[PDB]
Amino acid sequence: IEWYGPDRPKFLGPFSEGDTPAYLTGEFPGDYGWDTAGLSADPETFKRYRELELIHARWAMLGALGCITPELLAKNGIPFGEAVWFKAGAQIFAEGGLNYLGNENLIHAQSIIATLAFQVVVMGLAEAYRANGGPLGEGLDPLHPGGAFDPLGLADDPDTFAELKVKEIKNGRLAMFSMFGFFVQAIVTGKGPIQNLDDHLANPTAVNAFAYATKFTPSA
Amino acid sequence: KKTIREKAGWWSNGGNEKLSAFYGPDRGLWLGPLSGTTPAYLTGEFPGDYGWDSAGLSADPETFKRYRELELIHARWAMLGALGCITPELLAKNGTPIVEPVWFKAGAQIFAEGGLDYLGNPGLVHAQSILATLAVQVILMGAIEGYRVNGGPAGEGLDKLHPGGQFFDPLGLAEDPDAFAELKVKEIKNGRLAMFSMFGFFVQAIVTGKGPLANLDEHLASPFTSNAFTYAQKFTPQ
Amino acid sequence: EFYGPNRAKWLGPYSENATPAYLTGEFPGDYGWDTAGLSADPETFKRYRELELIHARWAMLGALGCITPELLAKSGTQFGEAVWFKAGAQIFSEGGLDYLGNPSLVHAQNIVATLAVQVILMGLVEGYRVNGGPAGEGLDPLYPGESFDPLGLADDPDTFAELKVKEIKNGRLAMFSMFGFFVQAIVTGKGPIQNLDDHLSNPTVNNAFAFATKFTPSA
Ligand code: CHL
Ligand code: CHL
Ligand code: CLA
Ligand SMILES: CC1=C[C@H](O)CC(C)(C)[C@H]1/C=C/C(C)=C/C=C/C(C)=C/C=C/C=C(C)/C=C/C=C(C)/C=C/C1=C(C)C[C@H](O)CC1(C)C
Ligand SMILES: CC1=C[C@H](O)CC(C)(C)[C@H]1/C=C/C(C)=C/C=C/C(C)=C/C=C/C=C(C)/C=C/C=C(C)/C=C/C1=C(C)C[C@H](O)CC1(C)C
Ligand SMILES: CC1=C[C@H](O)CC(C)(C)[C@H]1/C=C/C(C)=C/C=C/C(C)=C/C=C/C=C(C)/C=C/C=C(C)/C=C/C1=C(C)C[C@H](O)CC1(C)C
């Protein structure tokens, strides 16, 4: 499987000879030929959208792992005052604050405003450095800088670099899809992802999403 | 300059100045006599060109093409949907024993243990599994749309929007190029009306909570009494 | 400067390589913020500039119109419904929508006629805005002047430029603030001025995070 060039894998498979636009040359990772809406016809808008895709992908991978991990650790024994991810933020308003792994001695956060303030300070610093560089880079690539972000050195060969780019963007698209799912099915179900999987495995035919289909009907 | 019967619209097959109101420079525009500077890329060559690109989203010709295809496909799906969201309710108020004719509740019929009888007749489709329904549908519509986007058993070297072989123009209504050109406009206009009315169905569901024909009926009962402003305070933040 | 290459930018010092090649410091408010690349085409850029400025002007008017009645409300005027996100429901009251509380001023009773007149006049004026009319056969789509400058503030090009920047910046501020009005009316259910009063009463406890667990599904 090629992942590049004209004979690359495409998002409709065999159905995909004449659907791909002329501007989606197999140059960039994850180019399956999906621009039915034509939103990436301009190469500059295409570059900006590629950056958005990759950053959303990386953030979504981190977030998918961060929503899965505490729940797994929650049933595997560990105290998690609020393990479910869509209420993990409301721990600040509890009696003992947000203890990290349940340990009252680890972080013991009590004020959300100060937490948020530090977060804006350092996130702004880091994202500005990401845009225009800084202590970990001056004129590197906006997406794959390397140097300080390859302490292991996985991608010094261009072919390994390309295949790992594809792996990155695909795990990331998977994570973005899965995070969208987390959102919609938290809103719909009101339970965690792991508990949704447990319930689906307990009764797959009558514990699926269609059980929550008549939930949002107006009914006067 | 003409005679009475040509003013009255007689003598079909006199149509080359009747495309002038739907194609070309001096056509009808989105604000009529109050839309002066149409976007230069909306030259009047495509059907439904009223000069409306206030947001400039179709400035690139290729994304304009993709948006045209999106528009027409949405239009066709919305026409089918606008017809299908009113046919069951009309048929039920005429007396067909449909168990849930309201469209935003029509999907919940498959969870009743009598199944999803089509016209309320158990001898008909009688679907019980929504998952099997969805699987059949996914297989068929995937084949169907993949055939649409590149070609398939119903013609491969055809247009992406108006294939018009013997499978999609089997009545030959569009063999006259002028009839074709004006039928394109009729298609896109009925379809834009259907898309607007389907947005209306969606909003009238989320807001009103009744069927669309029920809304029509309660509006025709006492219009000034009952309107969309009746439900204006419904989404009050409490 | 607010123009040219050495202009103020959206990320300040960390903004040298974060601006596209097409965002030359030609237009007001160009801080170099097109991370999404939505204005790469100059024509789409022009249309988006018009949308920005019109949204800005409408949002300034609306911000003032949501702040003013509430101020006047506690300052001593009754205002049957002073809060802005229920100011429209006054038509369904007993005496209709009285402007400043005065039953003698407007005394509007029908919302459909109000709306009809509004569509009439608004369509006329917005079509005149797009293609001109009694107040401008051939002017700029955004800064026409010549009847929209009875005071004549912007006959000098430099004053014109700086007032353009001031306009678009007050307008971006108002658009942000109006978005805030929306989200925090939906979240809080109270007016903007009352939200400020409550924040000033106890800033550390009745900030937005007090309403954070409001939209949790909880099965
Ligand atoms: C030939 C068979 C084949 C078919 C039919 C498809 C079809 C698809 N592939 Mg694809 N692929 C196929 C082969 C292959 N794919 C891929 C690799 C990929 C990738 C990497 C990706 C795809 C994606 C897609 C999707 C893009 C179209 C879309 O977004 O649907 C849009 C239409 C719908 C979503 C309609 C909904 C369908 C369903 C009936 C929904 C049910 C309706 C709900 C009840 C409605 C809810 C009600 C609400 C409103 C209240 C689509 C499902 C993309 C994707 O996953 O996006 C989703 C994608 O990223 N494919 C490979 C490897 C080379 C293939 C090998 O042959
Ligand atoms: C060097 C420091 C510096 C930093 C870090 C920034 C940062 C920013 N400036 Mg900038 N500026 C900076 C210097 C300067 N600025 C300006 C002039 C301007 C202007 C005119 C504007 C900006 C704007 C912006 C923002 C654009 C990116 C954005 O939209 O945020 C995106 C990132 C976030 C929104 C993160 C949010 C943080 C927080 C954690 C969110 C909370 C999460 C929620 C709880 C989750 C939501 C819950 C859901 C589920 C409901 C960004 C915050 C723009 C702006 O105000 O947009 C908002 C803008 O219009 N700046 C000048 C004058 C020359 C500067 C001088 O140094
Ligand atoms: C790969 C990602 C992924 C995975 C593994 C799951 C897994 C699950 N989801 Mg989630 N979900 C996802 C993505 C995912 N979802 C996305 C993207 C959305 C937004 C559309 C949702 C929205 C959603 C809702 C609203 C609900 C679930 C629910 C569920 C559970 C029951 C399955 C179900 O009802 O199907 C629903 C699946 C979808 C709506 C779309 C996902 C599309 C899949 C990945 C592709 C089809 C693969 C499938 C095996 C092929 C079936 C063919 C045919 C039958 C159609 C199950 C644990 C339900 C739950 O909590 O039950 C306990 C529930 O209420 N999900
Ligand atoms: C391609 C194409 C083509 C054509 O042309 C057109 C179109 C169609 C348009 C296109 C498409 C597109 C799409 C589909 C998109 C999607 C997106 C997504 C899904 C995203 C996500 C995304 C996602 C994401 C970011 C995510 C993220 C996450 C995160 C951060 C997390 C966080 C967290 C966590 C951990 C948990 C805790 O407790 C808390 C919190 C804080 C919560
Ligand atoms: C032009 C312009 C210009 C400027 O520049 C910019 C702008 C403004 C942006 C633009 C505009 C645009 C617009 C307006 C759009 C719209 C759209 C729509 C409305 C769609 C719909 C759309 C719609 C649609 C598809 C619809 C569809 C439907 C369907 C399928 C149906 C289905 C069904 C039915 C039958 C019933 C049953 O029981 C169920 C169901 C299942 C439900
Ligand atoms: C720049 C950029 C860049 C990159 O590239 C991309 C992106 C990111 C996309 C972009 C961004 C954008 C944005 C942020 C936007 C925003 C917007 C807004 C906020 C608007 C507002 C807007 C706003 C507005 C109009 C407002 C308006 C207002 C009004 C009318 C008002 C009215 C009223 C009032 C007085 C009150 C009373 O009782 C009633 C009523 C009737 C209610």
Ligand 2 site, residue C8, Cβ cutoff 6 A: yes
Q: Which residue puts its alpha carbon closest to atom 4 of ligand 3?
A: A178
Chain B contact set for A218 (CB, 8 A): 104, 205-209
**A60 CA: distance to closest CA in chain B (Å):** 28
CA angle C154, C159, C161 (to 5 degrees): 95
Q: Which residues of B touch A37 (CB under 8 A)?
A: 63, 66-67, 70
Report yes or no on A5 lying in a domain.
no
A37 Cα to the center of ligand 1, angstroms:
15
In the reported structure, the alpha carbon of residue A67 is separated from the centroid of ligand 6 by a whole-number distance in angstroms of 33
Residues 6+ apart with CB under 8 A from A58: A168, A172
Q: Does residue A132 sit within a domain?
A: yes
How far from the centroid of its chain's Cα atoms is residue C113's Cα? 26
Q: At how many degrees (to 10) do helices B212-221 and B87-94 cross? A: 60
Confirm or reject: Cβ of A185 under 6 Å from ligand 3: yes
> Which residues neighbour A21 within 8 Å (Cβ) at sequence distance 6 or greater?
A33, A35, A38, A41, B62, B66
B11-19: which pairs have CB atoms within 8 A and are 24 or more residues apart? B15/B178, B15/B182, B16/B178, B18/B182, B19/B178, B19/B181, B19/B182
Q: What is the DSSP string of C57-97?
A: HHHHHHHHHHHHHHHHHHTT---TT-SGGGGGGGGGSSS-B
Residue A4 lies in a domain: no
Task: Return d(Cα C28, Cα C160) in angstroms, integer.
Answer: 10
Return d(Cα C79, Cα C101) in angstroms, integer.
Answer: 5
Say how far apart CA A139 and CA A132 lie, in whole Å. Answer: 8
C206 to chain A: closest CA residue: A113
Q: Report the C-alpha gap between A215 and A184 in whole angstroms.
A: 13
Could you tell me the two tokens for B133?
Answer: 């329904």
Q: For residue A220, which residues of chain B lie inside 8 Å, CB to CB?
A: 208-210
The answer to whether the annotation marks B54 as part of a ligand binding site is no
**C-alpha–C-alpha distance, residues B15 and C59, integer Å:** 48
**C155 near B CB under 8 A:** no
In a domain, A2, yes or no: no
DSSP assignment of B167-220:
SSSTT-TT-SHHHHHHHHHHHHHHHHHHHHHHHHHHHHHHHT-S-HHHHHHHHH
Phi, psi of C165 (to 5 degrees): -65, -45
- CA distances (Å), origin B190, targets A72, B70, B78, B165, B203: 53, 15, 10, 22, 20
B228 at interface of C, judged by CB pairs closer than 8 A: no
- C-alpha–C-alpha distance, residues B173 and B176, integer Å: 8
Distance separating alpha carbons of residues A85 and A63, to the nearest angstrom: 10
Name the residue range of residue A51's domain: 10-213
- Kindly tell me the burial class for residue B193, based on how many C-beta atoms sit within 10 Å of its own C-beta (0-12, 13-18, 19 or more): middle
Quick check: is A87 in a domain? yes
Residue of A11, A48, A56, A112 with the most ligand 4 atoms within 8 Å of its CB, for mutation: A56
Resolution in A: 2.8
Interface subset of C 56-95, CB within 8 angstroms of B: 85-86, 88-89, 91-92
Residue C190 DSSP symbol: S
Token pair listed for C84: 């802005």
Q: At what angle do helices A43-75 and A193-202 cross, to 10 degrees?
A: 70
Dist. CA C158 → ligand 6 center (Å): 28
Method: cryo-EM
Within a domain: residue A105?
yes
Q: Between helices B177-207 and B212-221, what is the axis angle to 10°?
A: 80
Secondary structure letter of residue B65 according to DSSP = H
* Ligand 1 center from residue B48 Cα (angstroms): 30
Report the nearest atom of ligand 5 relative to the CA of B53: 5
Provide CB contacts within 8 A for C150, sequence distance 6+: none
> Which of A17, A23, A37 minimises the CB distance to B150?
A17
In angstroms, the CA A156 to CA A94 distance is 48
HSE, side-chain direction, 13 A CA sphere, residue C125: 6
C45 lines ligand 6 (CB under 6 A): no
Q: Which residue of A has its CA nearest to C11?
A: A128
**Is residue A195 situated within a structural domain?**
yes
Number of domains in chain A: 1
Q: Cα distance from A220 to chain B (closest Cα, Å)?
A: 4
Specify the 3-state DSSP secondary structure of C112. helix
Q: How far is the C-alpha of B189 from the C-alpha of B228, rounded, in Å?
A: 25
